[PDB]
Amino acid sequence: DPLPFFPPLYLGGPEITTENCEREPIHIPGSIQPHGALLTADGHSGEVLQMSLNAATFLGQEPTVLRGQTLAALLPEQWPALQAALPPGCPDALQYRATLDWPAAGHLSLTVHRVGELLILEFEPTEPHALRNAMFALESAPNLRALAEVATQTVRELTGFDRVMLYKFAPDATGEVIAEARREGLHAFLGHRFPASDIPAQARALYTRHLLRLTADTRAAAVPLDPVLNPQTNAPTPLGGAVLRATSPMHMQYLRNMGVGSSLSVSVVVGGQLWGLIACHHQTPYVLPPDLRTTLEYLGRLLSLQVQVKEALEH
Amino acid sequence: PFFPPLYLGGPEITTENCEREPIHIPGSIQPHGALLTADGHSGEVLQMSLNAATFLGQEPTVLRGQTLAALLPEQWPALQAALPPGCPDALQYRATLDWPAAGHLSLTVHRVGELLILEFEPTEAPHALRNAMFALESAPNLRALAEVATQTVRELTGFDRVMLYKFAPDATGEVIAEARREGLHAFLGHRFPASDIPAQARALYTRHLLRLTADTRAAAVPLDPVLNPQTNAPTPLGGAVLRATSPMHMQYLRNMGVGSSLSVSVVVGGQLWGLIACHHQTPYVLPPDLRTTLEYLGRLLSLQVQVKEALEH
Numbered sequence A: 001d002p003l004p005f006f007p008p009l010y011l012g013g014p015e016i017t018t019e020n021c022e023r024e025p026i027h028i029p030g031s032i033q034p035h036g037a038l039l040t041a042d043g044h045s046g047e048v049l050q051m052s053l054n055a056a057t058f059l060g061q062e063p064t065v066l067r068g069q070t071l072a073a074l075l076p077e078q079w080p081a082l083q084a085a086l087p088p089g090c091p092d093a094l095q096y097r098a099t100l101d102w103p104a105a106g107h108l109s110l111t112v113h114r115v116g117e118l119l120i121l122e123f124e125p126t127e128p129h130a131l132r133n134a135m136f137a138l139e140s141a142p143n144l145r146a147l148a149e150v151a152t153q154t155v156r157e158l159t160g161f162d163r164v165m166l167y168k169f170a171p172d173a174t175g176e177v178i179a180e181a182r183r184e185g186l187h188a189f190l191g192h193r194f195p196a197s198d199i200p201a202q203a204r205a206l207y208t209r210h211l212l213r214l215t216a217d218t219r220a221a222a223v224p225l226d227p228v229l230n231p232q233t234n235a236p237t238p239l240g241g242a243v244l245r246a247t248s249p250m251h252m253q254y255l256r257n258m259g260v261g262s263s264l265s266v267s268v269v270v271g272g273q274l275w276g277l278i279a280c281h282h283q284t285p286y287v288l289p290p291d292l293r294t295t296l297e298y299l300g301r302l303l304s305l306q307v308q309v310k311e312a313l314e315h
Numbered sequence B: 001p002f003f004p005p006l007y008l009g010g011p012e013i014t015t016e017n018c019e020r021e022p023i024h025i026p027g028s029i030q031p032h033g034a035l036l037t038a039d040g041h042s043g044e045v046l047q048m049s050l051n052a053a054t055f056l057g058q059e060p061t062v063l064r065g066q067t068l069a070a071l072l073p074e075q076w077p078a079l080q081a082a083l084p085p086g087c088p089d090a091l092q093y094r095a096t097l098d099w100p101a102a103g104h105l106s107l108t109v110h111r112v113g114e115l116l117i118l119e120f121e122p123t124e125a126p127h128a129l130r131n132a133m134f135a136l137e138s139a140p141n142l143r144a145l146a147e148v149a150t151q152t153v154r155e156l157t158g159f160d161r162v163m164l165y166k167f168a169p170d171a172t173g174e175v176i177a178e179a180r181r182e183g184l185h186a187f188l189g190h191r192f193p194a195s196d197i198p199a200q201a202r203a204l205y206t207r208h209l210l211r212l213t214a215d216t217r218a219a220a221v222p223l224d225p226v227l228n229p230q231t232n233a234p235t236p237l238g239g240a241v242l243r244a245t246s247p248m249h250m251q252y253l254r255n256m257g258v259g260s261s262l263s264v265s266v267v268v269g270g271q272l273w274g275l276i277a278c279h280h281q282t283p284y285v286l287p288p289d290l291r292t293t294l295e296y297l298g299r300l301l302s303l304q305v306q307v308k309e310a311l312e313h
């Protein structure tokens, strides 16, 4: 039965059990994963409102100094570019990316998107023809099976992940592993099927709009935003569009129990519906840098197109 | 059918026999790169472009005996695996060579039956592609998508004019969006008859998605031999981007005052929906890595055109 979200934990909401799966408000956890930092800022003035508690250690500045400046002063070269790329009223799915040379922290990748009147800024550390070669190989795959196999093998070669599966949704939202590339010694998940509650309904809706999410370390504690609520609204900060957003504790326990240290997945979206997932596992924690993740994002789109094409060749 | 090419004493092309020019077998290439053909098994260099000596820095005869194994040691096994016998002519493999005579070359290979076609071009060596991809996806409708696409391509390439040219059901073409330098004519809204892009060129564009003319006044460079030794027949060059452009079509560019021209197929439901069409007033060799960006954009636009057309119908 579909039911509306509970309030999050920090607003006195209940703790999540196997009973109330579908009602966890996973998009507003009030916290991020510790391998990057996040700031929120007023979309018109550029006043800095919220920051992750670890921000001082990524950005090399005291909180009170950060919060006391506008983005115009903090990001003089990027602030006008942000404002042109992310105009008021734009969708929350639109992202702008730049690379910064920050004194204390080396090269940072900056990813920005806009939710209403809020700008959300994510900072992560950042670092030949493999993509072009893959694009052509995907297109020349003769059928859906060969496409799925080429796609899994390519992603594994690009990333070094221990296990890359193509996970396909059935009409009842159960899912099946239809191809996989895996490290020697791992047991096969090919042909296994998994029940619809394994990836509940509000996670699937979010995965139709925001096409990549990850858990770099399945044992890492989440880092709170400070303050936790958006001071504009005294309400929760929407983080569905932020890759740094903390992962559901229910989902992290599910991965730890499987022996997974690091998880990533890309959505494959066909005709406006979530067709499947490029799902990756690693046994140890593992951070895939932003520019490599971009390659996977591009492959997500290519695969969406090629899945349509291969399936049309099939009636 | 097709007329024989000129160099096999076929008729010269007019506006009476537009549909019959064998644009895939011109026997020559554009001079900003070099092409070798080679045997699929032996790696034996069978044809070369008369200009190969320039790019490769090799005494002419040296090449036309040697083997790819010898000539490209690191690459030759990769090719063997990447382009297995029986693969499609559409499948391409690329690498960057740090080659003694020329700082860096791009190498592009595909296979047509028993022949490997190798293309060499100068090359080199950020977020504009990722930023463009998200911009295309958030365009609210087909019109805005067209506008974003043309603007994005112009910004990435510096081309004087970028159009989105859409085919009607009878192959009548319409410029539905345009991004252009100040002080050019506007081709926005104009329609053009189907014969401007003749049937045999639309078919080839459905399979091989990017073509160009780098300089509309440059002479083609012959293949030597012109005929493939294997077959004593013309080498198919339809999947080669270095392939010489139809003089018929180069004349049409010169008459418009264009010095350089590039397009990408937008393919939807197995059919040619439209073209990303680019003009430059002067000669312009777009480097291979930037062309790759446009090739990606072509696929992304193909996806988004279907998405956007579905939310009208």
Ligand SMILES: *C/C=C1/C(=C/c2[nH]c(/C=C3[NH+]=C(/C=C4\NC(=O)C(C=C)=C4C)C(C)=C\3CCC(=O)O)c(CCC(=O)O)c2C)NC(=O)[C@H]1C
Residues within 6 Å of the ligand: A017, A018, A019, A020, A021, A022, A024, A026, A175, A177, A189, A194, A195, A197, A198, A199, A200, A203, A213, A215, A246, A247, A248, A250, A251, A254, A263, A264, A265, A279, A280
């Ligand atoms: C009562 C709640 C439960 C629950 C919740 C939940 N699950 C997700 C997301 C995912 N669950 C996945 C499950 C699988 N992993 C596998 O390897 C296989 C099969 C081989 C299955 C079925 C997967 C893949 C995801 C996607 C994310 C990822 O790839 O790692 C969420 C949302 C997480 C988030 O967005 O932060 C939630 C709340 N899952 C259950 O099984 C029950 C106990």
Ligand SMILES: *C/C=C1/C(=C/c2[nH]c(/C=C3[NH+]=C(/C=C4\NC(=O)C(C=C)=C4C)C(C)=C\3CCC(=O)O)c(CCC(=O)O)c2C)NC(=O)[C@H]1C
Residues within 6 Å of the ligand: B014, B015, B016, B017, B018, B019, B021, B023, B173, B175, B187, B192, B193, B195, B196, B197, B198, B201, B211, B213, B244, B245, B246, B248, B249, B252, B261, B262, B263, B275, B277, B278
């Ligand atoms: C007797 C045949 C004729 C003919 C042949 C021909 N045309 C092409 C390719 C193209 N023609 C194009 C025409 C236009 N360019 C524009 O800018 C506009 C309008 C604003 C039109 C109508 C285009 C866009 C192409 C595609 C290639 C490109 O991007 O430049 C070929 C094929 C050449 C080749 O693939 O090597 C041929 C044989 N064109 C005519 O107009 C008639 C006279």
